[PDB]
Design a protein around this ligand. Structure first.
Ligand code: PC1
Ligand code: PC1
Ligand code: PC1
Ligand code: PC1
Ligand code: PC1
Ligand code: PC1
Ligand code: LMD
Ligand code: LMD
Ligand code: OXL
Ligand code: OXL
Ligand code: OXL
Ligand code: OXL
Ligand code: OXL
Ligand code: OXL
Ligand code: OXL
Ligand code: OXL
Ligand code: OXL
Ligand code: OXL
Ligand code: OXL
Ligand code: OXL
Ligand code: OXL
Ligand code: OXL
Lengths: 313, 312, 312, 311, 313
C-alpha cells in the first residue's frame, strides 16, 4: 500500500484539498511574510484500500500514515517545510480516503506599498503536488473543507475573505507534471493609528515652521525652521525603518519627500527676506513674506490633491 | 490505539486541568505570552479495567504508545506545544490519569485603551475533535486546575487563573469539537510609567509654558520648539513599545492632546511678537497675561474630561 | 524496569543530586533569565540491579538509559525542558547507581534592581521530583558533586558562590509528593562601566547647565539649560531601555528623576531672574542668581546623600 | 549501503542540479541569504540494474534507506540544510534519479564599494568526499538547473542563476573532494535610497550654504551646526545597516567628504565674523562672496572625482 | 558496543583528534561568541573490530555510528551541544578507526577590549573526554588533520593562524579523569572602518567647538559648544551600545571620556570670558581666550600621547 493507487482506466488521480484557518498572525511588512495556523484536508481514491462493510462490520476503517500511501503535498512559498500533526485518517469502503492535519507555516507572500498606509493586500498560499512515474496527480478544491475560524485576527489588519482559486495551474518542471493551487487571503490595513502617530504630528511641525512668515527675526526664523526640519527627519526615519525598500514610490514616501521641498524653499525665503532687509529694501522683503503666508499653504493643499490623485485615482 | 467503546448511548468525557508552573514573556507588540504548565487528562477506558484484589497492585502504569490517548490541542498557540509525559496511571475500573509538562506560546489579543492602566484577560483554549466511532467532550476537573505561588508575570500582577467549566461544543466539517476556555487575569503595573514617561512629559510641557512670562521671541521660539522635540522623543518611545490599534489608547490621547498645547503656545508666541512688532503691546502683553491662566486651566480641564471618557 | 525499586522497609527513595557548573552566560536583565551549562549528577539505590563483584568479576556494570528505570528529575524554573546528554551510567555491586548528564537550560530567576547598578543578586536553580504510586521520592545533595569550574565567568558580573540548600522543601500537589531542591548562584554586578558611560557624563550635563547662574543672558541661558535637558532625556532613555519595568523605584532611577527637578527649578530661576531684570529690580534678580550659585550645588549633595542613605 | 563498484578504473559521476523555488532574506550585515530549492542528484549504480522487458516496470521506486546515496553537502551554509526527499526512482540500466526539496541559509560575502550601486554574485557550493573504495566526482546536469519565475529577492533584481560546470577537484585529508559552484547574480535596487537618503542629505547641505548669504554669526552658527547634526543622523543611519568593511564604500566616501564641507563652512563662518569683529569687512564679505561660488563648485568637482574613482 | 576497548597493558586509550575549519562566522562582541563550521577527525584503535582483508573481502570496513563504540568527545565552551552529522566511519584490519564528522557549533570565548578597536584576540575551542571506570581516555593531536580552508573569513576581522596546543591538560574532576585539548584561533580586528565612521567625525565636532575661542559672542558660543556636546553623546552612545560592559577601561572609552572633559573646561572658559567681559575686565578675558586657542589643542595632543602610551602596551 506504499505506492500510489493504480488507475483502472486512463485517468489522473484527483486530490481534494481544503484549508480552514485557525490562526493568522505575525504579518511582517519588512520581510513580507505572515504566519498561519490551519487545518489541511486531503481526499483521494485508492481502491486497494477498499473493503466490505458487512464482512468487516465497521462503518469506516482507520489507518496510520505509515500504513497507507499518502500523496506528497507541499506549499510553494514557505520559508521551510510546514510543521504538521496528523489529526485523523479514514477510509470509506470504496477506497476513498479522508485525511486531516493541523499545520503551522510561515508564508512568504510579497506586498504592495504604493498606497501605504491605505493599502489592501491579497496574501497567497500555494499548494503544489508532483506527479510520479506510475501516474499523474492533479489537485482540486472541496469547498466545504475551505474556510476560516471566527477568532481569526491579523493584528493591525482587517480580514475580508479567504477563498481558493478552483482551477489548478498545471505545468511541467523537470519531466514531471505539477499541479498548483492558490488560496488567497484578502486583507486591508488599519490606517487609523497612522493619523495621530505620524501624519498629524508631521503636519503640526510643518505649520509651526510657517509662523516664520510672520517674523522678521532671522535668528528666530532660522532656529524655528531648522528645528522643525530635524523633527521631520525623525519621522522620516521612523517611517522608513518600518518598511522594506521598494523599487517604487510609496504614497507616504511621496508626501514625506514633498514636505522636504517646502522646508528647503522656506529656508530660501527666510534667507532672501533677511538679505533684502539687510540691503535696505524691506519693501520687497515684506512683500514676498506677505505672499508666502498665502502661497505656501495653497501649493501644499494643491500638491497633496495632485499626489492623492496620482496614487488613488 | 482505537478509542473506548460506549457500553451505553453516551459520549466520552475527558477531564482536563491546567496548573501553571512558569508564566512569562508577555509581549505587548506581538500580543503573546509564554507559559509552562502541567496538563492533566482523565477518561474511562473500560478495555483496560482489572481486578484490585486479584492483581494486587493498586494502580497500573502504561507508556503512551501502549494505550489510546485522546488528541487534545490548544487553539491559540504559535505552534503545537512542546510536552513531556510525566506519568500515566490506570485504576481498576478503567479510569486513566494522564499528566504531561508542556511549554507553549499563547496568542491572546489585548485591550490597550486604558494603557498603561489596563487589565487583561488571557485565554488558553483546549480543544478535542470527535472521531467516527465516538464523540469526545471536554470537562473541567477543578483540583487539577491552579497555579504555583512563585508564578510571576514581569511588569504584571496576576489576579486569577480559573477555567470556564462548560465547554462550547460545535460543528466543524461534519465532526464535533469540544472547546474549553482557561482564563488568566492580570493587571498592568503602572508605577514605572509615572517617573519614566508621564512626569517628564509634563515638565517639558510646563517648561514650555514659561514662555508666557517672556517677551523675547528668539528665546521663546527656542524654548517652545526644543520642548516640542523632546515631546516627540517621548511620543516615539511610547508608540514603538505598543502594537498599532484600530482604536485610541488613553496615553495616546494625552500625548496627542499635548501636541495641541504646543501648537497653540506657538501661535501665542508668534501673535505676541506680531502685535509687539506692530506697536500694540496693549493687546500683546494682555494675551500673554491671559494665557498664563488659560493654558494650565484648559489643560487640567481637558485631562479631567479625557480621564472621564476613558475610565468612567 | 519501567517500574521503581520496591522498598524492603517503610522508607522513601532518596536520590542524590549535584550540579557542577561548566558554562554560565547570557544574563538578561529585561527578561530576568540566564543560561547555564552544567553536569547533573544523580545517584540512588535500586536493589534489583545488584550483583556479586567476585562472581561477576567486574567492579562496576554499565547500562544504557533505556535498560533501567531512572527517576524523572525536572527543573522548576526553565523556559523549556533542559537539553541534556547522558555522559555515563554505572551500577556498583550493591545496587548503587551513578548517573551523569551534561545539560544546558535557560533558567528564569527574578532580580532585585533597587540598588542598580550597585546591586547583588542570588540566582535559583530548582530541582524537583514527583513521587509515584508504588513509592515516594525525596531529593538530597551530595556536596562533592556540587561545584563550579574555575573558568566559569558571567559577563559583566562577578561570581561570589555556587552552593546548594541541603534540606529539600517537600510539599503536596495533586495527591502526590514533590521534593524540591534549591541551588543558589551568588553574584555582584560589575558597576565600573556605568561610571564613565552614564553617571559622570550625566553630572557634567548637569553642571554645565549651572553656569547659567553666572550668566545674565536669557537667550543663551534658555539655550544652555534646555539643551542640557535634552541630553538628560537621552541618558534617561538609554538607561530605561536596558531595564525591566519594576513596580518599585531603583537607585539610578531615583537619581535620574531627582535630577529632572533641578532642571525644572533651574528654569524657574532662569525665568524669574529675567522677569525681575526686565522689571528693573536687578537687586533682587542678581541676588537670587547669586544665591542659586550656592544653593543648587548644596541642595544637590544634600539630596544625593539623603538618597544614597535610603537606598543603602 | 556501500558505494557502487568500478567496472573499469573510473570515478563515480554524480549529476547535480539546483532549481530555485524561493530566494529571500538577503542580509547585508551578516552577509547571508536564505534559499529554498530542489536538489537533483543522478548517478549509476549497476547493482540496482534490472531488465526492462523481463521486470516489466519502466521504473522502480525506493525509500532512502534501501539504497546507497552519496553524501552531498553545501560548503557555505550556517548549518546543514533542512531537506525532504521528494522522490527516488531507478531506471533499468541502474541510473538513479534523486530529488529533494531543501531550505538552507547560505553565507556568501558581498562587495560594498559601489553601494548602493553594487551588483553581487552569490555562491552556493556543492561538495562530495571520496570514499576508500571509490572516487566521487560532481558534474552539472543543466536541465535540472534553474529558478522559478516567481522567485524574488526583496530590494534586489536577480540577473541569472547559472552553474560553473567544471568542478574544482582537490585533496583534503587523504581523500578527494569534488566541489561545484552555483552562482546567483543580482543587482541592488537603488531607487529608494534616492528619496530616503541621498536627497535629504543634499538639502541639509545646501541649507547650510545659505549661511554664506548671511552676516549673522548667531544665526549662522545655529544654522551650520544644526544641519551638521542631521548629517550625523544620516551617517549613523547608513552605517548601522552595513557591515564593517576593511575598504571604503562609495556612500562612505560621499558621507565622509561632506563632513569636510561642514568643517570648512564652519571655518569660513568663524573667519567672516573675526574679520567683521576686527573691522576689515572688505575681506570678510569678499571671502563670504567667494564661498557662495567655491563651495558648490569644489563640491561638484569632488563628487565627479569620487564617482570617477568608484566607477 | 556500550563498553570501551580493553587495554593490552596498563595504558590509556589515546583518541587522536583534529579540527579543520570550514566556516568561521558571527563574531558577536557584546555576547563574546562566534559560530564555526568544521570537520572533526577522531582516530583510535579498537581491536575488537579487527578483520582479515582477504577473508572479509573489504580493504576497509565501513560502520554506522550505533554499530561500534565511539568515545564521547565534547566541547567545553559551546552554548549547546554541537550539531554534528557524521561524514564517514572506516576501520582498517588492525582495529584502527577513522572518524569524520562535520559540526557547527557556537563557541563562547571571552575577549580583551582594552585596545579596541586596535585589539587582537585568541579564540579558544576546547575539546574534552571523560574517562570511564574500565579504562582511561586521553586526547592527542594529529596535525595533518588540523587546519582551515583558504576561504575561511571572519567578517570585520583578519585571521592570523589556526593551531592546536598539543599537550592535553589532564586533570581530575569528580573521581573520573578529564583530558582537555585547546584549539586556538588568532584574529586581529580590522580597524579601518572605525576611522571615517567614528574617530574622524568625533574629532571634527571637537575642533568645531574650539572655534568658540575665536568668538566673543556668548549666545553663539554656548549654542556652538553645547550642540557639539550633544553630537559627542550620540557618538559615545553609538560606540557603547556596540560593546559589552567591561570591568576595565577601553582605549576608545578613555578617549571618549577624556573628550568629555575638554567640553567641560571649554564651557568654563566660555562662561568666564563672558563673566569678565560683563564686568568690564576685557584685559583678562580676551587674554585667556587667546591662550585657550593654544593650550586646548596642545593639552589634547599631549593627553592623547599619554593615553596611547598607557594603552600600548
Ligand atoms: C514633488 C512631489 C514628489 C512626488 C513623488 C514623485 C513620484 C511620483 O509620485 O510618481 C507617481 C507615479 C504614479 O504611479 P501610480 O502609483 O499611480 O501607478 C499606479 C497606477 N494606478 C493608480 C492605476 C494603479 O508613480 C510612478 O511613476 C512610479 C513610482 C516611482 C516613480 C516616480 C519617480 C519620481 C521620482 C521622485 C523622486
Ligand atoms: C484628544 C483625543 C481624544 C480622542 C477621542 C477619544 C475617543 C473616545 C471614544 O470613545 O472613541 C470611541 C471608540 C471606542 O469605542 P466606543 O466608545 O464606541 O465603545 C464604547 C465603550 N465604552 C463605553 C467602554 C467606552 O474609540 C475609537 O474608535 C477611537 C477613538 C475615537 C477618536 C476619534 C478619532 C480621532 C482621530 C484623531 C485623534
Ligand atoms: C527620589 C525621588 C523619588 C523617589 C522616592 C524614593 C523611593 C523610596 C520609597 C521607599 O523607600 O519605600 C519604597 C520601597 C523602596 O525600597 P528601599 O530600597 O527604600 O527599601 C528596601 C528595603 N531595604 C532597605 C531593606 C533594602 O520600595 C518602593 O516601593 C519604591 C517606590 C516607593 C515610592 C516612592 C515615591 C517616589 C515616587 C516618585 C514619583
Ligand atoms: C575627501 C574624500 C576622501 C574619501 C576617501 C578617499 C578614499 C577612496 O575613495 O579610495 C578608496 C580606495 C580606492 O579603491 P578603488 O575602488 O578606487 O579601486 C578601484 C577599483 N577597481 C580596482 C575595481 C577599479 O580603496 C578603498 O576602498 C579604501 C582603502 C583605502 C583608501 C583610502
Ligand atoms: C582616562 C582614564 C584612563 C585610565 C588608564 C588606565 C590604563 C591602565 C592600563 O591598561 O595599563 C595596562 C597595564 C597592563 O599591562 P598591559 O596589559 O598593557 O600589557 C599589554 C599586554 N601585552 C603586552 C601582553 C599584550 O597595567 C595595568 O593593567 C594595571 C592594572 C589596571 C590598570 C588600572 C586602570 C584603571 C583605569 C583608571 C581608573
Ligand atoms: C583620535 C586620536 C587617536 C587616533 C590614533 C590612536 C590610535 C592609533 C593606533 C595606535 O595608537 O595603536 C597602534 C596599534 C599598535 O599595534 P600593536 O599593539 O601590535 O603595537 C604594540 C607594540 N608594542 C607592544 C611594542 C608597543 O596598531 C596600529 O598598527 C595602528 C596603525 C594605524 C593606526 C592609525 C589610525 C589613526 C587614524 C585616526 C586618526
Ligand atoms: C537629527 C535628529 C533626527 C534623527 C532621529 C532618528 C530616530 C527617530 C526614531 C526612530 C528610531 C527607531 C525607533 C523604532 O524603530 C523601529 O520600531 C519598531 C518597533 O515598534 C520595529 O518594527 C523596528 O525594527 C524598529 O527599528
Ligand atoms: C540627546 C542626543 C544625544 C544622543 C543621541 C542618540 C544617539 C544614539 C545613536 C545609536 C542608535 C543605535 C545605532 C546602532 O545600531 C546597531 O545595530 C547593529 C545591528 O544591525 C549592531 O551591529 C554591531 O553589533 C554586532 C554584534 O554585537 C557586531 O559584531 C558588529 O560589528 C556591529 O556593527 C549594533 O549592535 C547596534 O549598536
Ligand atoms: O513542503 C512544504 O513546502 C510544506 O508544505 O510546508
Ligand atoms: O490516524 C489517526 O486517525 C490518528 O492520528 O488518530
Ligand atoms: O535677526 C535679524 O538680523 C533680523 O531681524 O533679520
Ligand atoms: O496526546 C496528547 O498530548 C494530545 O492530546 O495532543
Ligand atoms: O496542537 C496544538 O496546537 C497544541 O495544543 O499544542
Ligand atoms: O501547531 C501545530 O499544529 C503544529 O505546528 O504541529
Ligand atoms: O526679540 C524679539 O522680540 C524680536 O526678535 O524682535
Ligand atoms: O529522566 C530524567 O532525568 C529527565 O527528567 O530528563
Ligand atoms: O523539564 C525540565 O524542567 C528539565 O528537565 O529541565
Ligand atoms: O557678580 C555677581 O555676584 C552678580 O552678578 O550678582
Ligand atoms: O547521503 C545523502 O543522502 C545526502 O546527500 O545528504
Ligand atoms: O551540510 C550541508 O552542507 C548541507 O546543508 O547540505
Ligand atoms: O552682499 C553682497 O552681494 C556682497 O557682499 O558682495
Ligand atoms: O552675546 C551675548 O549674548 C552677550 O555677550 O551678552
Amino acid at each position: 500500500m506504499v505506492s500510489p493507487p493504480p488507475p483502472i482506466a486512463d485517468e489522473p488521480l484527483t486530490v481534494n484539498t481544503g484549508i480552514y484557518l485557525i490562526e493568522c498572525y505575525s504579518l511582517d511588512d519588512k520581510a513580507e511574510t505572515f504566519k498561519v495556523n490551519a487545518f489541511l484536508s486531503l481526499s483521494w481514491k485508492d481502491r486497494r484500500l477498499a473493503f466490505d462493510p458487512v464482512r468487516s462490520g465497521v462503518r469506516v476503517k482507520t489507518y496510520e500514515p505509515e500504513a497507507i500511501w499518502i500523496p506528497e503535498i507541499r506549499f510553494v512559498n514557505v520559508e521551510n517545510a510546514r510543521d504538521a500533526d496528523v489529526v485523523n485518517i479514514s477510509v470509506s469502503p470504496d477506497g476513498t480516503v479522508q485525511y486531516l492535519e493541523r499545520f503551522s507555516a510561515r508564508v512568504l507572500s510579497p506586498l504592495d506599498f504604493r498606497r501605504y498606509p491605505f493599502d489592501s493586500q491579497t496574501l497567497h498560499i500555494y499548494l503544489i503536488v508532483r506527479s510520479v512515474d506510475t501516474r499523474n496527480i492533479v489537485l482540486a478544491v472541496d469547498l466545504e473543507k475551505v474556510g476560516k475560524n471566527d477568532d481569526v485576527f491579523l493584528t493591525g489588519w482587517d480580514i475580508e475573505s479567504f477563498t481558493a482559486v478552483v482551477k489548478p495551474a498545471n505545468f511541467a518542471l523537470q519531466n514531471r507534471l505539477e499541479s498548483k493551487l492558490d488560496y488567497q487571503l484578502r486583507i486591508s490595513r488599519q490606517y487609523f493609528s497612522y493619523i495621530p502617530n505620524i501624519i498629524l504630528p508631521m503636519l503640526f511641525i510643518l505649520f509651526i515652521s510657517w509662523t516664520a512668515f510672520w517674523s522678521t527675526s532671522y535668528e528666530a526664523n532660522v532656529t524655528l525652521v531648522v528645528s522643525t526640519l530635524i523633527a521631520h527627519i525623525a519621522f522620516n526615519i521612523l517611517v522608513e525603518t518600518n518598511l522594506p525598500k521598494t523599487p517604487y514610490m510609496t504614497y507616504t514616501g511621496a508626501i514625506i519627500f514633498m514636505i522636504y521641498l517646502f522646508y528647503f524653499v522656506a529656508v530660501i525665503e527666510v534667507t532672501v527676506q533677511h538679505y533684502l532687509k539687510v540691503e535696505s529694501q524691506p519693501a520687497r522683503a515684506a512683500s514676498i513674506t506677505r505672499a508666502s503666508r498665502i502661497a505656501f499653504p495653497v501649493v501644499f493643499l494643491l500638491a497633496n490633491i495632485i499626489l492623492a490623485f496620482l496614487f488613488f485615482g
